[PDB]
């Protein structure tokens, strides 16, 4: 039977993001996510301040 190897990562945490292959876009994937959650946080907080 043609046999294959299962791809996985050591000390696999679902809460942490996976092992990024490309270092040139790893930081933009981390930052285009962080930026979005921080933008949601600051907009939610300023509108709670306004109300």
């Amino acid at each position: 039977i043609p046999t294959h190897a299962p791809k996985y990562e050591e000390n696999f945490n679902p809460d942490k993001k996976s092992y990024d292959p490309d270092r040139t876009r790893s930081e933009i994937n981390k930052m285009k996510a962080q930026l979005k959650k921080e933008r949601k946080f600051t907009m939610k907080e300023i509108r709670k301040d306004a109300k």
Binding site: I28, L35, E38, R39, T42, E45, I46
Partner: peptide, 26 residues
């Protein structure tokens, strides 16, 4: 390869100034 990263870090620092002029514990 660098324009996206430095404008992203600059606007992130800008929104950090927006968070920093108010108190806004994050």
């Amino acid at each position: 390869h660098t324009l996206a990263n430095n404008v992203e870090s600059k606007l992130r620092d800008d929104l950090e100034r927006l968070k920093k002029i108010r108190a806004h514990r994050g």
